[PDB]
């Protein structure tokens, strides 16, 4: 994610003395910081969000893109009987 | 003497900028080729509901990967994408010296 | 135009088309660390809240 | 002769004391003390003291070097003697495998070189010596100490040294530690060091030596008034980048401007908010201004102006500021200002919510909790005068 | 314009732009008379100076640093005041005050 206009930016910074290259052969995945399943989450729409709500926001965006969430505001949860076991026993 | 210095100061880069109505802040600016037809009409594509803003997508990046970061590019030339230039010139009147860099291990 | 923000063209405009980035912008960006207080308050307000298989 | 001896003894003791003392917190004082005592007849003693100190704090070697230089500028012979002593020490260290001593001595030498006391030739020689016995640990730190200086003065020598080091690294089976040291040195190079019979006469000489050794405001106003939204104004102000001194002044000016306008404008408030968000110093300035107001500048204003000010403050405090407030005798203009502020707060927040917020902060001045023998009655009365709650509850609590 | 919508101007950028343009046009009219429009030969002195010191005595609303914004995200979605645009002229750091700050907002 963060590596959008990385290399170019680096070049600009360094007056073309350092040449970056990014790659993905380690297949090295990693937890998006922050915690999904949070309805309070973040403040900004336009800016980059904070790091505790980063996971959530991304997920929401993905959902929106898919057409999973229907509308401007939504949530993510388990569909099961008994009101999701009474919200996991409160 | 370093050719890589001219990153986003190429003729090609300038042309791209002109096309995309996108000033590399140091460089020049022109009348846009195409009039900015602001008729998105709040579609489900490129919405702020949908996309994420980790990167700010600077217009520096537009002229570097025109066809990617910029949407609906037109008459956009392709830019260069280069190697680095380790070239050391002695100013103190000396001959073949490893001055600015460091020795091998073995 | 620089980061989608400069005035499209210098002509017509009837102006320099110069663009100082604002220092209110920074302020707007920042108060999630410093709005933050409000968030904290909110949090405080709502802060308290098989064997067979094995 | 006996007297002279005694004096010398005293001097030595003094020197020792100074050495013991020497630190960053009281360096100037130490220097002064040193200056007070004689060091021509007791030059040897002084030298001994200095050397001893060096041997001991090695971290305060630079200071020592500086002191030596200072001494040398006046009395050069002493400096020379000191240098000689240092050299001797170094030699001894080299002889006896006293590595720590060598390191200390080397450091001292480097310091001296840096301060134009001893020549770089000596340093070069030392380096050469170190090289001859494959001693990387000794010459590495010394080089670092006197690297930039060396480059400046004897560039060729420096180059030679570098070459030698390189050779050692590559064309010699060096140890791991040695290799590491070499690498470090290289890195440093890349950045260029980023981190008696005539006793009476003498005495007389020494004593002599000792003896010898509105517009701005206007501009601000213009800025405030040459700006559509408050935001713009704030930006303009920030562009100026006035010193942390003048921030308070600026704030005061802004306040004055606000007062001048017929009624309270959101603009000024907005500007304040912008400033406040921007930096802690501006916040501090604002706080100071506030303090000044309720304390000393509040009673000067006419009513409408005062009201406006109160409103502004309320706006600031409804969100941006921390509710910190310092409030029988103090009740004319001030009381009305307070009332206005309260009203503003109510408008912004919502009564119960506002009350809760107030409670949350320490707040002893606005609402003192302790009964204090019917002193809270006045406060209650005041509150009643401008429609408010909780006062009654407080009253009930105390009885 | 300003007395009618005092408070409501600040937000609308198009109106601001028009004002900037309109003011400039007006200035040029005067400069048209003098058959030049050379930007140095008319320092703001000659326009904004009142008639009681021999000037035209205009009442500018043009020297405002206009709110620019991401026109990508402006018409679309949501907004905030970031990046000011030029406003109207080259100045000699001569901050000409703006009529709006001398008009008490409607609220």
Curated annotation (Swiss-Prot), chain A:
<comment type="similarity">
    <text>Belongs to the TRAFAC class translation factor GTPase superfamily. Classic translation factor GTPase family. EF-G/EF-2 subfamily.</text>
</comment>
<comment type="subunit">
    <text>Belongs to the CWC complex (or CEF1-associated complex), a spliceosome sub-complex reminiscent of a late-stage spliceosome composed of the U2, U5 and U6 snRNAs and at least BUD13, BUD31, BRR2, CDC40, CEF1, CLF1, CUS1, CWC2, CWC15, CWC21, CWC22, CWC23, CWC24, CWC25, CWC27, ECM2, HSH155, IST3, ISY1, LEA1, MSL1, NTC20, PRP8, PRP9, PRP11, PRP19, PRP21, PRP22, PRP45, PRP46, SLU7, SMB1, SMD1, SMD2, SMD3, SMX2, SMX3, SNT309, SNU114, SPP2, SYF1, SYF2, RSE1 and YJU2.</text>
</comment>
<protein>
    <recommendedName>
        <fullName>Pre-mRNA-splicing factor SNU114</fullName>
    </recommendedName>
</protein>
<comment type="function">
    <text>Component of the U5 snRNP complex required for pre-mRNA splicing. Binds GTP.</text>
</comment>
Swiss-Prot record, chain B:
<protein>
    <recommendedName>
        <fullName>Pre-mRNA-splicing factor 8</fullName>
    </recommendedName>
</protein>
<comment type="subunit">
    <text>Component of the U4/U6-U5 tri-snRNP complex composed of the U4, U6 and U5 snRNAs and at least PRP3, PRP4, PRP6, PRP8, PRP18, PRP31, PRP38, SNU13, SNU23, SNU66, SNU114, SPP381, SMB1, SMD1, SMD2, SMD3, SMX2, SMX3, LSM2, LSM3, LSM4, LSM5, LSM6, LSM7, LSM8, BRR2 and DIB1.</text>
</comment>
<comment type="function">
    <text>Functions as a scaffold that mediates the ordered assembly of spliceosomal proteins and snRNAs. Required for association of BRR2 with the spliceosomal U5 snRNP, and the subsequent assembly of the U4/U6-U5 tri-snRNP complex. Functions as a scaffold that positions spliceosomal U2, U5 and U6 snRNAs at splice sites on pre-mRNA substrates, so that splicing can occur. Interacts with both the 5' and the 3' splice site, as well as the branch region. Has a role in branch site-3' splice site selection. Associates with the branch site-3' splice 3'-exon region. Also has a role in cell cycle.</text>
</comment>
Curated annotation (Swiss-Prot), chain C:
<protein>
    <recommendedName>
        <fullName>Pre-mRNA-splicing factor CWC21</fullName>
    </recommendedName>
</protein>
<feature type="region of interest" description="Disordered">
    <location>
        <begin position="1"/>
        <end position="53"/>
    </location>
</feature>
<comment type="similarity">
    <text>Belongs to the CWC21 family.</text>
</comment>
<comment type="subunit">
    <text>Associates with the NTC complex (or PRP19-associated complex), composed of at least CEF1, CLF1, ISY1, NTC20, SNT309, SYF1, SYF2, and PRP19.</text>
</comment>
<feature type="compositionally biased region" description="Polar residues">
    <location>
        <begin position="11"/>
        <end position="26"/>
    </location>
</feature>
<feature type="compositionally biased region" description="Low complexity">
    <location>
        <begin position="32"/>
        <end position="42"/>
    </location>
</feature>
<comment type="function">
    <text>Involved in pre-mRNA splicing. May function at or prior to the first catalytic step of splicing at the catalytic center of the spliceosome, together with ISY1. May do so by stabilizing the catalytic center or the position of the RNA substrate.</text>
</comment>
């Amino acid at each position: 994610i963060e590596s959008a206009g990385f290399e170019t930016d680096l070049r600009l910074s360094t007056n073309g003395l350092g040449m970056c290259q990014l790659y993905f052969w380690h297949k090295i995945w990693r937890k998006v910081p922050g915690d999904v399943l949070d309805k309070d989450a973040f403040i900004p729409k336009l800016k980059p969000a904070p790091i505790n709500s980063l996971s959530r926001d991304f997920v929401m965006k993905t959902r929106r893109r898919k057409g999973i969430s229907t509308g401007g505001f939504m949530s993510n949860d388990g569909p099961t009987l008994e009101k999701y076991i009474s919200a996991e026993l409160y | 003497t370093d050719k890589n210095y001219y990153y986003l100061f190429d003729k090609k880069s300038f042309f791209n900028g002109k096309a995309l109505n996108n000033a590399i802040p140091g460089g020049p600016k022109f009348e846009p080729l195409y009039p900015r037809e602001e008729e998105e009409d709040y579609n489900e594509f490129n919405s702020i509901d949908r996309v994420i803003f980790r990167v700010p997508i600077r217009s520096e990046y537009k002229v570097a990967f025109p066809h990617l970061y910029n949407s609906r590019p037109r008459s956009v030339r392709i830019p260069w994408y280069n190697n680095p230039v380790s070239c050391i010139i002695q100013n103190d009147e000396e001959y073949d010296t490893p001055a600015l860099f460091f020795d091998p291990s073995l | 135009s620089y980061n989608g923000i400069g005035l499209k063209s210098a002509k017509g405009s009837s102006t320099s088309g110069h663009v100082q980035r604002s220092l209110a912008s920074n302020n707007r960006r920042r108060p999630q660390g410093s709005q933050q207080q409000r968030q904290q308050r909110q949090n405080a307000i709502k802060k308290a809240s098989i064997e067979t298989h094995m | 002769i006996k007297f002279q001896r005694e004096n010398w003894e005293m001097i030595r003791s003094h020197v020792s004391p100074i050495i013991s003392n020497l630190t960053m917190d009281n360096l100037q004082e130490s220097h002064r003390d040193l200056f007070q005592v004689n060091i021509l007849i007791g030059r040897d003693i002084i030298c001994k003291n200095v050397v001893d100190f060096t041997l001991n704090n090695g971290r305060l070697i630079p200071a020592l070097s500086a002191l030596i230089a200072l001494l040398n500028s006046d009395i050069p012979d002493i400096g020379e003697t000191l240098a000689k002593e240092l050299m001797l020490m170094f030699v001894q260290q080299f002889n006896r495998k006293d590595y720590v001593s060598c390191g200390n001595i080397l450091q001292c030498l480097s310091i001296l070189f840096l301060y134009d006391v001893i020549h770089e030739i000596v340093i070069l020689q030392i380096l050469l010596l170190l090289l001859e016995k494959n001693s990387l640990r000794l010459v590495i730190a010394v080089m670092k100490i006197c690297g930039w200086k060396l480059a400046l003065v004897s560039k060729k020598t420096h180059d030679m040294i570098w070459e030698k080091l390189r050779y050692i690294l590559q064309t010699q089976e060096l140890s791991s530690t040695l290799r590491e040291s070499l690498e470090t040195l290289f890195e440093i190079r890349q950045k260029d060091y980023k981190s008696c019979e005539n006793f009476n006469e003498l005495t007389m000489a020494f004593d002599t030596l000792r003896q010898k050794l509105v517009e701005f405001k206007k501009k601000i106003y213009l800025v405030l008034k040459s700006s559509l939204s408050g935001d713009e104004a704030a930006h303009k102000l920030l562009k100026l980048k006035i010193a942390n001194n003048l921030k308070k002044s600026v704030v005061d000016i802004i306040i004055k401007s606000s007062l001048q306008e017929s009624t309270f404008s959101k603009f000024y408030s907005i500007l304040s908010e912008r400033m406040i968000t921007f930096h802690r110093s501006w916040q501090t300035a604002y706080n100071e201004t506030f303090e000044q107001n309720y304390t000393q500048d509040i009673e000067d204003y006419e009513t409408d102006q005062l009201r406006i000010l109160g409103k502004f403050w309320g706006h600031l405090i409804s969100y941006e500021f921390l509710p910190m407030d310092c409030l029988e005798e103090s009740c004319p203009q001030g009381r009305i200002f307070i009332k206005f502020l309260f009203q503003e707060l109510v408008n912004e927040l919502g009564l119960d919510e506002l009350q809760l917020r107030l409670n949350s902060s320490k707040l002893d001045g606005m609402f003192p909790l302790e009964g204090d023998a019917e002193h809270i009655r006045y406060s209650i009365n005041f509150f009643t005068a401008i429609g408010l709650g909780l006062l009654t509850e407080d009253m009930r609590s105390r009885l | 314009l300003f007395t009618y919508f005092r408070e409501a101007i600040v937000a609308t950028e198009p109106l601001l732009d028009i004002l900037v343009k309109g003011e400039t046009r007006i200035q040029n009219r005067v400069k048209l008379g003098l058959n030049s429009k050379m930007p140095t030969r008319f320092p703001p002195a000659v326009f904004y100076t009142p008639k009681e010191l021999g000037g035209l005595g205009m009442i500018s609303a043009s020297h405002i640093l206009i709110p620019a914004s991401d026109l990508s995200w402006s018409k679309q979605t949501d907004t905030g005041i970031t990046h000011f645009r030029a406003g109207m002229t080259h100045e000699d750091e001569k901050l000409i005050p703006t009529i709006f700050r001398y008009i008490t907002t409607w609220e």
